[PDB]
Structure 1
Amino acid sequence: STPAITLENPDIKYPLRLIDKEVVNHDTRRFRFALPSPQHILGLPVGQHIYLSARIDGNLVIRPYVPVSSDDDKGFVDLVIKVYFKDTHPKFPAGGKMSQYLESMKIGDTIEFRGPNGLLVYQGKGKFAIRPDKKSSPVIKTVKSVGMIAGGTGITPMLQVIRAIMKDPDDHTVCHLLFANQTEKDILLRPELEELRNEHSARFKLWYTVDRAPEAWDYSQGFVNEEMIRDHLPPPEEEPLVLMCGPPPMIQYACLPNLERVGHPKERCFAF
């Protein structure tokens, strides 16, 4: 028999109870929610995300988040979410709606989950099923290596895929991650990433850039650029899939032009 599935229907909302919150850094936390019983699984293909929804201040608010847990995990789901606080940034006095609602939840409070959703599914052993859009059937891309460019919380879909690969000893796909954040203290999930490197260095290449670097720094500095792509992702002739996820300007100005300069074609690139 197979475990009971939480997300049985993508149009149903499932209220899940918050059970734990763990600090990732000054503004980011892992939020762990209980599934309907301890034996359930979420029901989420690798590559997919969920949506959270709530009535915040009298208006329904819906936002997507990528679980970093998997269908191997019985009884819980983990999200890694950056909180955009009010009364902090001069351009954003109110902060972010959903992320502060989440930050304010008490353990035992519920929030509605729905899913799965997304254009990409990782089918294992280098196989990716990618829809060109939400109005098209998937096509299955088969690769030996995967470049991953993440900015900030854009790490979450990358980590979800990395974890899926590394746990299968017969999955020979090599992941090359280039992870960009504003400062060293903004790096998310660093111990794991470095733990994954320590354990799986033949399948996992790790590199960082930060917008402003500290004095003691052995990685790159600045926005993602041509040189970083050329040095820290597989080269075009090895026909990798290049996955990217981060702020819209990151994608538009740092990733797309520089991917084109290196020679990774559109049709081998995917933005979460």
Structure 2
Amino acid sequence: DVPVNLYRPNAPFIGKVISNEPLVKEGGIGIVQHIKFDLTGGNLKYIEGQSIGIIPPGVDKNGKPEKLRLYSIASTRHGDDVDDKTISLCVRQLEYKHPESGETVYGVCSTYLTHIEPGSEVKITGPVGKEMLLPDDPEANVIMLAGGTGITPMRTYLWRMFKDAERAANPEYQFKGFSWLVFGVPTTPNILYKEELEEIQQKYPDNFRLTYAISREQKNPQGGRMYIQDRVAEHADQLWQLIKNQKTHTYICGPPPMEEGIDAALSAAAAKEGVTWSDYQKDLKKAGRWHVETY
């Protein structure tokens, strides 16, 4: 059923870049690009929540070919144009400090991708992953906790749930549950897919709630910069109440350090009802209702 590894590193699918557009608006921090690839000529198929590998050209400092880097798929199974002909990615250009051999360091694969030109051929592998799949039940509740590019799998879920063209193409999935996205980024211009996310909330006020944690524009009750963990603590009781439903699924995607604060928040909420979150969570994971993908 679930498509997986239709293409592997030894014989990748050679796709062509259709478009490469900026997602970080003026005044934002960093570079994050939405890149769409043409899948025609191959049989790569995928579903929401999966990832694909990209093999960048060139060799590493040791002279060996570069290995693949995984990227969460940003598009639904049908592609952004709902034509079953493309696949998209949401790629941040990795760049960091000086104390790392030299002065400025740019990630190999992410810099290759963010600067790639339309028409270029790219080596693609996958799809991969069964840990971040969306339930087929249209009545399920879906909690999405995302940091930065962690928004990516969430975009695939939300588009499938709320885009007009998606609903028309998926007669078997007419979402009527409740979805809540808590999205943490440093600035408003850094709110990836902002316009479309807010459009969805305006059209489906009873099925989608959007909450932002904007660090450079908001402060938590302690006076520190606002991060996703702070919003989760602020809404811990509401989130725990939703999590208690047998049909609720939670997805966490973003930096590894985000998990600790989220668990501490939910632990305090669950404790009010005599429940130890760490134990309840273990059962949720075993039931496949607690999905995590951090990097």
Q: TM-score range by the shorter chain?
A: 0.7 to 0.9
What is aligned with 2:287? none
Distance 2:237 2:215 in 1: 18
Give the drift of 1:176. Answer: 0.6
Indicate the SS of the match to 2:153. helix
Q: Does 1:79 align with 2:89?
A: yes
What is aligned with 1:140? none
Q: Supply the AA of the counterpart residue of 2:249.
A: L
Distance 1:228 1:21 in 2: 37
**Structure 1 pair 144–122 and aligned structure 2 pair: CA distance change class (3 A):** closer
Distance 1:179 1:231 in 2: 18
Of residues 251, 256, 259, the one that matches 1:248 is: 256
Of residues 49, 52, 70, the one that matches 2:51 is: 49
Of residues 67, 73, 79, the one that matches 1:67 is: 73
Q: Does 1:155 align with 2:155?
A: no
Indicate the SS of the match to 1:173. coil
Give the drift of 1:230. Answer: 1.7
Aligned length: 243
Q: What root-mean-square deviation, in Å, do the aligned CA atoms of Structure 1 and Structure 2 show?
A: 2.8
Indicate the SS of the match to 2:257. helix
Q: Supply the AA of the counterpart residue of 2:22.
A: V
Distance 1:144 1:179 in 2: 20
Report 1:207-222 matches (<5 A): 207-213=211-217, 221-222=226-227
| Cα contact 2:93–2:107 (8 A) shared by 1 | yes
Q: Supply the AA of the counterpart residue of 2:144.
A: M
Distance 1:42 1:256 in 2: 37
Distance 1:56 1:262 in 2: 50
Q: Does 1:199 align with 2:203?
A: yes
Indicate the SS of the match to 1:248. coil
Q: Supply the AA of the counterpart residue of 1:16.
A: G
Q: Supply the AA of the counterpart residue of 2:34.
A: R
Deviations 1:21-66 (A, max 9, x none): 11101511111111124xx774102221111112333431311112
Distance 1:123 1:53 in 2: 30
Give the drift of 1:146. Answer: 1.5
What is aligned with 1:16? 15
Q: Supply the AA of the counterpart residue of 1:230.
A: A
| Cα contact 2:51–2:71 (8 A) shared by 1 | yes
Indicate the SS of the match to 1:55. coil
- Could you tell me the TM-score, scaled by structure 2's length? 0.72
The runs of 5 or more residues in structure 1 that have no matched partner are: 127-142
Distance 1:146 1:228 in 2: 18
Give the drift of 1:123. Answer: 4.3
| Cα contact 1:124–1:171 (8 A) shared by 2 | no
What is aligned with 2:239? 233
Distance 1:213 1:191 in 2: 18
| Cα contact 2:91–2:114 (8 A) shared by 1 | no
**Structure 1 pair 57–192 and aligned structure 2 pair: CA distance change class (3 A):** same
What is aligned with 1:172? 176
Q: Supply the AA of the counterpart residue of 2:245.
A: E
What is aligned with 1:134? none
What is aligned with 2:222? none
